[PDB]
Amino acid sequence: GSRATVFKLGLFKSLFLCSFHDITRLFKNDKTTNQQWVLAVFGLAEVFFEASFELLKKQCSFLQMQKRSHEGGTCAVYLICFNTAKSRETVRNLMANMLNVREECLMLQPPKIRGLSAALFWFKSSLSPATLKHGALPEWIRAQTTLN
Amino acid sequence: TEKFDFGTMVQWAYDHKYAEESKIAYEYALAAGSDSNARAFLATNSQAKHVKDCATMVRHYLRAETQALSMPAYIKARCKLATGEGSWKSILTFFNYQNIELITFINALKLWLKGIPKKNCLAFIGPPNTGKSMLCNSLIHFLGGSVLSFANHKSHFWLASLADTRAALVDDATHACWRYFDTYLRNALDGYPVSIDRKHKAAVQIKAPPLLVTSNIDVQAEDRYLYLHSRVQTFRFEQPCTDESGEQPFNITDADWKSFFVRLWGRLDLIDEEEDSEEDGDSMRTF
């Protein structure tokens, strides 16, 4: 359980300088499946962040990961494109176990696939040397910065 | 669109500070993996001309960026560029090894850096194998100044390097070098403008930048160089130095110089004017 709180949203914004709501759309039912997911994790240890990159690569067509911590705390973000569609219930169980964290430490919603600022978010992230990357960029992001 | 855009290439080349053509071409062809303008450039049948223009523009931007900084900003940038582990102790220990106070060296360094006339040349006089060139080469490496060579003084273009760098070094000045300074280049030690050529260029008249010389000859003792006693500050190096297992008992790093300048930003009296923008977005308006 534990979708999110004013405190988790507040920390995300203080670190990434934009609202978690501006890069995701809403799935109110924990059973609806989808290949693409946006994940935010608070209080995650570095060794598990790095291990998750190698493990997710084997079941994904695309993956982009980054992290940002400060005085408040640490919180990473993942754009995950699974080879097979999964529900929030399933992804929640997979990632809490994989990252060695309580479910309350996570926030999960599918991506906002229409909107230039939302696409720019991922585009700008791909320009940092620290960002971990795997696979070909999703068409909605690519076509979000093209159009002649 | 896929049309190539030269401004982006110039911005990128300036971004990592690639100036020479070969590095620009190689690194850009490598970057062509994830740069739409790059994958456009590879197909543009006029690659060589674009590379030449990009290198020339980066050279222009960098050269006109360096010359636009007053001295304290230049030393600040050089301190920003210096990394390592060290301290000023690894210098003052050497000076005490040669039995000279550091306070006198600071009272000289302040004037030398300010370029004040008649006090704009430090001469380090010491017998061979006492460590002169070690300290001088370390200091001129930190100040990012060029080193001259009295070998070519038959060919008068050996001063060509004096047109850019802000701290010239002349190591192991013989009798001929001191006579040359006494007769011809008195103006530079004064500080009045001089004329200097540059291979295939015109004699660009500029003020003479500060110097730093090492010579066995004691100018302030001879009588032929009576007219240099009022243009040279000397420091005596007497105690011995490197003869031990290929490791000079003293080697001066860049961290030493960094902690030296930073710790003595008050005694050398280096500062800037009314400031309201120091740690901000660098003006990268070259795109």
Place this chain on the structure above:
Amino acid sequence: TEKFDFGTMVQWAYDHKYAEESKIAYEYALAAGSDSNARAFLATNSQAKHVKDCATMVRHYLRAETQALSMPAYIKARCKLATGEGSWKSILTFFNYQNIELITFINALKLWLKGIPKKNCLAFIGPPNTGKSMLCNSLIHFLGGSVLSFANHKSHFWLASLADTRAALVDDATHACWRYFDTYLRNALDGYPVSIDRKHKAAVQIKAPPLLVTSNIDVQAEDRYLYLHSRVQTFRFEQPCTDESGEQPFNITDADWKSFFVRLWGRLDLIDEEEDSEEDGDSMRT
């Protein structure tokens, strides 16, 4: 019918390392038989410009590629290119014929390659026709360096051949050459940057690369070179390496040096343990 595309032509040129312009022009005009782009080149109305631009682009690529290789990687790339079959036994037996243990030459190479100051020059001293130039020039040829020439020291333009290469040989340094080293290149043997000068150009300030010098004068016995004692490691080549009875028994082809390096990668304190996927990515630079 088939538009020209300079990119694939520069890719083809870099494929075969055809740096010079004339070879480009001739080989590509020959290849026009079975390469549509080459027929487009032949029908093109500005052929010479394309040849010149291709030559320039290939030169840029190759020069930058050479400059960017770290020293162990460059030794691997010079080990690949040396052709022939032989053995390090020639080096070992040459040395043991000069009564010099190999371990001495190793413990000198270990430093001389690392560029450690004050141990960055290896002098081979012995009366002539003793095998100095044999080993010294074979080793410089292996390292892809440039053989210098002490003769032109009347001009200061004889150091220009050190702006690029990573190993220099100064052959038969007489007293004049030793004095010149002691006076003007005091810095170079100390590893710190020097100021070389070329003809009709401007001086550049680069690090002094390693060196190999051959001389008949024992500098570590002279006194005016008291400074030179601390930055030159002497090697006494005394015995006659050349013909004992008419035919030189000893010669070091590139295979001998290559096998020497391959078997002595450990004791030199280098690293070529890449073995990444199969050999290397080496994808493309079109």
Place this chain on the structure above:
DNA sequence: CCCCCCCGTGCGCGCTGAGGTGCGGTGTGAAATACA
């Protein structure tokens, strides 16, 4: 269960030709106005 920042702009002078689109020089009459 709703807002604490992504975002620094436009191109070889010069052509010039097929392309088609339209209100008119001219396409020039059956309908349409009025005559007797």
Place this chain on the structure above:
DNA sequence: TGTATTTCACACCGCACCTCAGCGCGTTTTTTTTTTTTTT
């Protein structure tokens, strides 16, 4: 009911606009040259 007297109405045929990018597109003396001073 027969007939002089006229613009709208679909259009011959167009004068002439704007629209692209494949064709043209570049510097090299002076210094260094070994020459004879330039202490000796």
